[PDB]
Amino acid sequence: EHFPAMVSRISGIGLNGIQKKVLEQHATAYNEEVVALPVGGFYRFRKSGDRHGWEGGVIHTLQQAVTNDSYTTFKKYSEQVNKRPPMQLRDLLELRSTKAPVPVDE
């Protein structure tokens, strides 16, 4: 409807959401009181609200894992990493299959 021709291989939010998010952010600045702009953690993880894939915790566990050389430690890092809220499209995909499990050795 509104812009020149550009692809958008996945529709996303629309006017309604836009509206909403716009307004929320507006409250924050008027339907309340504000001293300064927050810090920001876009360009760099602070221990802010903008998350990141690589944030200290996980990094540690990785480094650990691969120094002490435990697969187990590795395995908690991945979990640290896999248990968050979605941040990336693959994150929106589950993996179901219709075969029954085979033994790892195979």
């Binding site: 200290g56 990785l62 691969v66 050389d69 395995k75 896999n82 219709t98």
Partner: protein, 105 residues
Amino acid sequence: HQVLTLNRLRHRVRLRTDGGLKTGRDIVIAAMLGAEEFGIGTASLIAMGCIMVRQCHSNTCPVGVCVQDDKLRQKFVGTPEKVVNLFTFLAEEVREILAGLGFRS
């Protein structure tokens, strides 16, 4: 993957991908979308010690990773062994998943 398939050229070339893959599943999903080889940098950098402080352009790397300065380079504790481990895990983590889906490869 698609188009190449649609033109019957998709068997002529191998596909590889990279971008933030940090994990077993990240790799499996890539495969299913069609990839056959996966590229792993940053994470392998981190295992050699990067701490993600973003001063690569600056030549002040806390850890001997992205820096030409001597003194700084002496702080490097990277190891073939460490990296090797990184891959070794990812892999096993992959096989773990496959066997989950009932596939043996």
